[PDB]
Structure 1
């Protein structure tokens, strides 16, 4: 009924994208809600209380659904910043299939007019599942067909015990539009105005921002003893900040906030012989349940020379293609690493600095201590994390009064009103009912599943590059490898793969 659209057109300031996939929806839990909780495996920090439902929802939060590696490359080089504007959404071509096995023969008979029902909610009245970056995105590669993920959510509890504060929902309680074969569904959405993302990295570090030639007019304490006295020491002396002394020169703005992390080497010989990692493992907690700190405040991973060391937690660790689900060794997985924020934000492993302690006197020798943590303070600037490619797009600000600078910590655009979820469900069709009345709930049903196509379209808005720089740039380029193995392309047997993640910071602006 609709016309397949996968394509992108360049309008200049704005750029439109569209993609389309084929989806298949099973039927979950045989059409009945369930209470699910932890197995009570004695780990108190690990417990949950929640409900599984038959409802399916398909959720696109990741880039590679929308952008093809080419278009990614073409956008990432030429633009300072970009944000979405609207989006349009269209289902079409719905159809239903009924599987029935007579003896061992598995047979699939098409059917008509058996209905599927769908509803969105623009009112944000449901638990909001997306944003935890669960798998099940539209497949990277358009050829493949994917199943839709089951729904569910958690709630307040203690161990297996659930409080009286706990809530519950019955999703049928909303006005779901009904769909039958030959019918299509659309709704137009609008993104709220949100600051551009930053695609660039600065060309000059904070400490080095100054004029080399001219000496500023402030002074600083030079040396205590003239030499001597020594017992009488000597009167204070004063010198001026100059080309020779960079450290003493004075600065307006302070680097961003910090938090310590643990240093883990890739080389097992250097790493601590004994056991660590939860020894270990910087954490926070609620209600006596310690939550290991996953990717945290932005900060730089490593200094120049090491390159071997990496943070133990904050750095996102993706798996490669065909990766194992459990106990996989490093060589099968990709580590993302940020050396580009060295210009402002602190190094992760290192301390924030040293701070005065004692109040000195003649017999009292000065004492200091390494500061292990620093909160926000006036006159500070910092840079946001990179969005990569397979990384998430938008997350929802938790609806609350308390906020400070709502930037998600996986990177993305914090939205006050994210694109509404869409949920989808088959209509239960009863099996042969009993002849006489039965007080029973009638648990019999007919097995089936459906399929169709989904068209997602986003209209981006850009900011073009005005850069006046002289010498050549740095660009992203796949090259220098003569290997028979080609990147971003099917193997001989048709299994797609991604060589390495792709960060967004390539171009350059002065600070």
Structure 2
């Protein structure tokens, strides 16, 4: 009631990747100097389970999303069990399996966050949406530092066979518990009222701003400047003690595709920054914006988010599959998307001298700013692991989600190598001749989120996202015919409304 407890489980399959041998991986020499990566590929595999798919399913997303203002995770517990090591041999056109029993698997974990922590991109393949079937574990490895291809001093290279591990035979299991520290609840409410009008419309404030300057002489010219008390009426002159959050700009692009010159403006016309002289564009903006009321056919080029419609073939797939989140609901506070934040004076005015204006395309944070977060679509990420640093400035990760400083640990996996027969003559160096095998087992987690209840004295119904209706040949979600699973539309949580 006060808090909800989630539990999941899955089965998984672990191959062997590098042939049990680290391989440094680097960028191609033909890759443009905007792109160079120099790094390592380890055999170890690792679990992810960072996304909301794992823990909810649509119904329990409603039950959560409609009834609560906010929530946070209060702990988690985690389990591996039913570990079944398995062998495979290929003779000629023949196959075999024959589980080999006593062979083991290595796991450990890091509380110390010592090893490089890489999730962060929401790389695909965390866990299957929907409980059925199975997923093969992805392997590890990391970029570090490059310069132009090549290498520089420092440049890391950890080992991963150092740390005390645990070696788990068939019929042995592994767990650990973890507890989040705390974070402010994630927002849900949609902010009934905009900032621009917070005011009682009936009375009028006692400040006069400045009325029409100039005024006729005579019929023409005087420097007379007069004042008019504000309130009701024109509004828009209201003295206001708060400010809307910061923004840049984006290149507006239409889903209609009736427009946009020919043209290729991307990525040339896109917004980007270059760190260390290598251009980098910005996929999430600082979480903000919208398109605008009544438009819906325009969206920011690099803004918002994509996802996609299964099955989605990468690299040049057309618009129908992508799904393009709208982001319209934060319109209350954040300063929309592609607009000049607002005009500001430039040149002073003499008797002979006209004044600008000339405005601006950006702002930056200022005292008295307020802004809201972003929304989380349940196929999105969860926690971002703020880097270990100084200059935080509170961490509202652009992906959305929680800002953990000590995220849940990482827990890589590997299955111990078994050599084939040696030559008995001793030898130079190290033979490979490995015995091909892989592994499988279960997995669990659980969370126990804590959520704050909802209460409001509003008189009328509210929105409360629904299942829609009416005779779709294929409803959604649930499998169509031959076993493929679907997920039409994104969801995200802002529905309940709180007065600002």
Provide TM-score, normalisation by structure 1.
0.96
Return the offset for 1:471: 0.7
Q: How many pairs were matched up?
A: 500
Deviations 1:146-197 (A, max 9, x none): 1000111011111221101211111011111111111111111000111100
Deviations 1:430-463 (A, max 9, x none): 1111110101211221000000000111011010
Report the Cα distance in structure 2 between the residues aligned to 1:348 and 1:168, rounded to whole angstroms.
Answer: 42
Return the offset for 1:368: 1.0
- Cα pair 2:290 2:329 within 8 Å, conserved: no
Report the Cα distance in structure 1 between the residues aligned to 2:357 and 2:80, rounded to whole angstroms.
Answer: 65
Aligned with residue 366 of structure 1, among 355, 362, 368 = 355
Report the Cα distance in structure 1 between the residues aligned to 2:272 and 2:10, rounded to whole angstroms.
Answer: 41
Q: 1:85 aligns to what?
A: 74
Q: 1:449 to 1:222 in 2, by over 3 A?
A: same
Report the Cα distance in structure 2 between the residues aligned to 1:349 and 1:478, rounded to whole angstroms.
Answer: 32
Report the Cα distance in structure 1 between the residues aligned to 2:288 and 2:4, rounded to whole angstroms.
Answer: 32
Counterpart of 1:331 in 2: which secondary structure?
Answer: helix
Report the Cα distance in structure 1 between the residues aligned to 2:358 and 2:430, rounded to whole angstroms.
Answer: 70
Deviations 1:305-354 (A, max 9, x none): 21100000121011111011121000122110111111000111111011
Counterpart of 2:197 in 1: which secondary structure?
Answer: coil
Deviations 1:32-80 (A, max 9, x none): 0001000122411111011000000011110011111100010000000
Counterpart of 1:109 in 2: which secondary structure?
Answer: coil
Q: 1:286 to 1:466 in 2, by over 3 A?
A: same
Report the Cα distance in structure 1 between the residues aligned to 2:450 and 2:15, rounded to whole angstroms.
Answer: 37
- Cα pair 1:255 1:381 within 8 Å, conserved: yes
Counterpart of 1:72 in 2: which secondary structure?
Answer: helix
Return the offset for 1:92: 0.5
- Cα pair 1:24 1:145 within 8 Å, conserved: yes
Q: 1:307 to 1:235 in 2, by over 3 A?
A: same
Return the offset for 1:356: 0.3
Return the offset for 1:486: 1.5
- Cα pair 1:201 1:340 within 8 Å, conserved: yes
Deviations 1:91-121 (A, max 9, x none): 1000111111111101111111101111111
Report the Cα distance in structure 2 between the residues aligned to 1:443 and 1:99, rounded to whole angstroms.
Answer: 17
- Cα pair 1:40 1:159 within 8 Å, conserved: no
Return the offset for 1:229: 5.2
Establish whether residue 497 from structure 1 lines up as the match of residue 478 from structure 2. Answer: no
- Cα pair 1:100 1:106 within 8 Å, conserved: yes
Extract unaligned runs of 5+ from structure 2: none
Counterpart of 1:74 in 2: which secondary structure?
Answer: helix
Counterpart of 1:429 in 2: which secondary structure?
Answer: coil
Deviations 1:215-262 (A, max 9, x none): 100002111123235775132111010210211111110000011100
- Cα pair 2:74 2:448 within 8 Å, conserved: yes
Report the Cα distance in structure 2 between the residues aligned to 1:393 and 1:326, rounded to whole angstroms.
Answer: 26
Return the offset for 1:484: 1.5
Report the Cα distance in structure 2 between the residues aligned to 1:495 and 1:432, rounded to whole angstroms.
Answer: 44
- Cα pair 2:245 2:365 within 8 Å, conserved: yes
- Cα pair 1:81 1:462 within 8 Å, conserved: yes
Q: 1:230 to 1:172 in 2, by over 3 A?
A: farther
Counterpart of 1:377 in 2: which secondary structure?
Answer: coil
Provide TM-score, normalisation by structure 2.
0.98
Q: 1:28 to 1:42 in 2, by over 3 A?
A: closer
Counterpart of 1:106 in 2: which secondary structure?
Answer: strand
Report the Cα distance in structure 2 between the residues aligned to 1:36 and 1:225, rounded to whole angstroms.
Answer: 71
Q: 1:150 aligns to what?
A: 139
Return the offset for 1:400: 0.6
- Cα pair 1:61 1:131 within 8 Å, conserved: no
Moved more, 37-46 or 50-59: 37-46
- Cα pair 1:359 1:366 within 8 Å, conserved: yes
Report the Cα distance in structure 2 between the residues aligned to 1:311 and 1:41, rounded to whole angstroms.
Answer: 32
Return the offset for 1:274: 2.5
Counterpart of 1:364 in 2: which secondary structure?
Answer: coil
Return the offset for 1:370: 2.4
Counterpart of 1:509 in 2: which secondary structure?
Answer: coil
Return the offset for 1:267: 1.7
Deviations 1:446-504 (A, max 9, x none): 00000000011101101000111001100110123312112111011010000000010
Establish whether residue 471 from structure 1 lines up as the match of residue 467 from structure 2. Answer: no
Return the offset for 1:208: 1.1
Extract unaligned runs of 5+ from structure 1: 1-11
- Cα pair 1:19 1:66 within 8 Å, conserved: yes
Return the offset for 1:20: 0.3
Q: 1:408 aligns to what?
A: 397
Q: 2:219 aligns to what?
A: 230
Q: 1:365 to 1:231 in 2, by over 3 A?
A: farther
Report the Cα distance in structure 2 between the residues aligned to 1:352 and 1:302, rounded to whole angstroms.
Answer: 14
Return the offset for 1:272: 2.2
1:341-356 alignment, distance < 5 Å: 341-356=330-345
Counterpart of 1:466 in 2: which secondary structure?
Answer: coil
Return the offset for 1:266: 1.2
Deviations 1:114-139 (A, max 9, x none): 01111111000011111111001110
Q: 1:230 to 1:432 in 2, by over 3 A?
A: farther
Establish whether residue 271 from structure 1 lines up as the match of residue 275 from structure 2. Answer: no
- Cα pair 1:27 1:426 within 8 Å, conserved: yes
